Every structure is written in C-alpha cells, then in structure tokens.
Point group: C3
Chain length 190, copies 3
C-alpha cells in the first residue's frame, strides 16, 4: 500500500507518499507538512490525497528519537505498542487497547509507524527473560509473555521467542525530569 | 568574514572563529564557551575578539537539532527566520522583525509566533529542531504545521490560519523553505501540558 | 579495587550504555536511569546497585533523561579522579567513591569520582572535549560535564527570565568535557516559554 521515506539520522520524521485515493492515519498534531492536494479530517486524524499527484505528508513524534517502519505482514499481522510510541498507520489498521501506561494492539496487512525516544533498541528473544523499565517499552510481537509489576520502579518482565523494541528515553521520563528540575523557580512563590 | 566549524552529528553547535577585531552577534543564552580574549556587550549580544590572535566562541540552540550556515549572498541578502530558530550571525547582519502574532491559548499564546528578517552580505546560522527538511517551491503550495517553519527566502508568501488546535501556515511561490521536524513549540508545548 | 566492567555504547547521537557484568559484579546508577536488564541482574537501593546474581555474562542498560551521548572515562587515565556535574553522572563501577566537590546556589553540584574503575558520564547535545594548557576558558555553567585535576574553577552570575546567566571560569591544565545542550538549559528554556 503506502510508500514512505524516513528522513534524518538520529532524530527522524517519516514522509508518507500518498497516491490519489490513499489515506494515512495519525494522532492529532503529529503532522509536519502537507503537499498541495492532501486534505485532513478529524475521526485519530485521517489524511487523504484528494487530488491527482504523487503526494506527501510528514509525521514526527513530539520528543527526540527515531521512527521504525513495521510491515504488519512481517509479524503475523499483529504488533503490540505503547500509546505514546504510535506515530501513524496505513488506513485500514485496527487499533484499540490491550492517564496511566497504555498498551495498544495494532493489526492488519499494512504499514505501521512507531517512534522510539532517544536510542532505538531492538532485541530478539528466544525463551530468554528480559526485564524492562515499563516506560521504555515501545512495541513487541506475539510469543512474548509480558508482566507489569512494582517495587516499593514499575517493571515489565518479558519472556518467550519474538521481537521487542525498546527506547532509552521515553517521553514520560523526559517530561517528568524536566518538571522536577524546575523546582526552584516554582518554589520562588512560597 | 567569519570562519566556523559546526560540531556534532544530529545535535549541533557552531564554533565561530574570530580574527582580532571581528564580531559575531547572538542571543547570549545560546553561548556554550569562549576563549580568553573574547569580550561580550549587550547590543542581541555582540561577541568581539579583543586579542591579537584567533579566538573562538561556540553557540547552540536550547533544544535538540542541527545547525545550518546560510550565506546571505547565496539567497539575495535576505532571510526570514523563526525567532527560536535564529542562532547567530556575522556582525553587520541586519536583524529585524518581519512578523509578530500571538495565536490562541497554546504555546503561541505565550511569546507569540515571531518571524525575523536577516539582511546583509554575511553569514547567518539558523537551527532546526529534530531534522531539517529543506524544500524548493517552484510555484507550488506547501501547508506546514506552524511551528515547523524554520526559514524561507524571498518569493514565498505565507499566512497563518487556525485550521479545523491546528495552526497552519500556507506557503506559496518561489524559493527555498527550511522546515524542522521537532520545533521547540511542539517540544515545550507537549511537555508543558503533560506535566499537568 | 573496583569491579572491572565491560560495556558497549549503543546508538549514534542519542546514546545508551549497556554494561556487562560477570557473576557477582556490580554497577552503580541512580534509580530511574536503567532501561533494561537481562535475567540474572538483581538490584538493591543505596543510588542503586545492579548485580549479576547468576551465571555468565549479564547486561543492564542505562540512559540519562535528556538527549545526548555517553562518555566512558577510565579513572586510571585521570589519576583516579574525575570532577563531574551531578546531572551528567550516569553509572560507575562498584568500588567507585562518589563525593561532593562543590555546591553553589546563586538563585549546582560537582561530584568527585574516585577509584580505579570505569565511570560513564552523559553529555547533552554534543560532547565537546577540550584540553587546557595553561589557559582560561569561560563556559555556560550547565555546559560543564566533567574535568580533571589541574583545573581551577568558579561559578558566578554573569551580570553583564531577564537575569541569571551563570558563567564558569576554568583555568589551569587538564581535560575539560563540555556538552552543547545541558538539561538545565533545556528545562529552563521550556519552563520560561510555557510556565
């Protein structure tokens, strides 16, 4: 279905090629630019080529990092992913769940696009168990038993054969640490 | 007039090499370091080499992304620049405002959306958050998420609309556009209202 | 003697250190830094110690909460001592002694790292390494990642938000590590533009 180009080295934007007829779906506010005949509509926000040219719409996440293109057919037409990490999808993708940490399921035959904050980390699992700061979980396949747990620092335990995609800098860690660091300036009142 | 080297790969800083008597202008919150005989004066801050040999001062924007040198000669002696995107310029650069406009109750409700005009015959350095997307127009229409506009040459018309909140900038006409994938306004905005 | 860690630095401009621990080896990092860990890694609180409690080579990964690169510094290459901005510190071999060299509130903490093992600092934006040979360098205070003995320093309000530029003056002989995008600049600029 969709053609695309992933621009940038460590920080990435995905330029979606939309031929006349084709739609692409994305979270509100991910879009960078539209060429000419692209038109958009709210309901998830859908971008469609309304004219007659090979056209472009670019998307990028609101924190620094890389975009991974995942052909759904390459992974049994299913991919689990953290709601923050979802960037965009070939129209006719089923979403839904599987503001606390949210895991989403995406399934279909098309292209899906996920963002990994900071470093992208890809690992193959073969019976091995991997433990993962929960926010650092980007996406994973089937064949992976996952289990979220707690200290008292929320940890996710993964086990099986299959693929996990991790990120070194989740948006939640970045935003929370930014807030923390602002303490003095905001203490200046009381 | 100015020698420089751009350091780093995806995240960048500009180290300006100053000969004796030479000057670079920058907002002073962008400076990272300066060698010994560099002096600075509030009017934009001016950094001058007050020594006898080569001196250095480096500058970086306060959000991740890359630096581009733009020779004003190469673009008619005028560039339009989002203010957050201005990094530094050679002394003699004429820096003015081409456009100021508040816009709603989000990020551009604060300071506002500000386009500067940079004119002259020297070197200008601008910064693009995330990756830089450079585009030549050739009588075409480009619609851009408003904060994503870094810089543009003459021959390009622009105006900002509230779309269907979605702030859109429509570009139409000639030359070169410089766009950024992760504008500070998007970075700061999403972070602001997420810690809320 | 500190444990002898192995490692690999993952990524290009935005990096993470994956530390490799042999049975019974330990690495020290602040809580919240770790990204993943293999099956036999265990951890306890005091800064938390991550230990290979099982068999063979095991791995824990760590990153800083802002974009930049990782620098491995072998303390032996620096006479057993590194000065380090607090936020720049990422992780260190067990046996590393962490002290406070400096604190100043001007309206900013330097730790001292000591031992014979590996330490890992983080540089926001780009790393700029510089060598001083009897010279003075003036830096934006947050841009200071680390330095060696031989270097004299102080933090002052620049003077000449609408106020508050901190300037660090460095002088002497040794290595200085600088970052182009300090967390404090990033946090402060975001705060100013939104809050």
């Amino acid at each position: 279905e969709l053609d695309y180009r992933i621009l940038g080295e460590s920080m990435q934007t995905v330029e979606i090629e939309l031929d006349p007829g084709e739609t692409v779906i994305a979270e509100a506010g991910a879009m960078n630019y539209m060429t000419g005949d692209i038109r958009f509509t709210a309901r998830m926000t859908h971008f469609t080529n309304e004219g007659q040219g090979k056209q472009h719409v670019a998307f990028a996440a609101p924190y620094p990092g890389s975009v991974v293109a995942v052909d759904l057919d390459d992974v049994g037409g299913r991919l689990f992913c953290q709601k923050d990490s979802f960037l965009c999808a070939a129209y006719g993708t089923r979403v839904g769940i599987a503001e606390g940490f949210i895991l989403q399921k995406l399934e279909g035959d098309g292209l899906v696009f996920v963002h990994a904050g900071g470093t992208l980390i890809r690992r193959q699992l073969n019976g091995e168990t991997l433990r993962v700061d929960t926010g650092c979980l980007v996406a994973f396949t089937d064949g992976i038993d996952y289990d979220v747990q707690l200290a008292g620092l929320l940890l996710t335990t993964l086990k099986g054969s299959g693929t996990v995609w991790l990120q070194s800098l989740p948006f939640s860690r970045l935003a929370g640490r930014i807030y923390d660091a602002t303490f003095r300036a905001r203490e200046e009142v009381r």
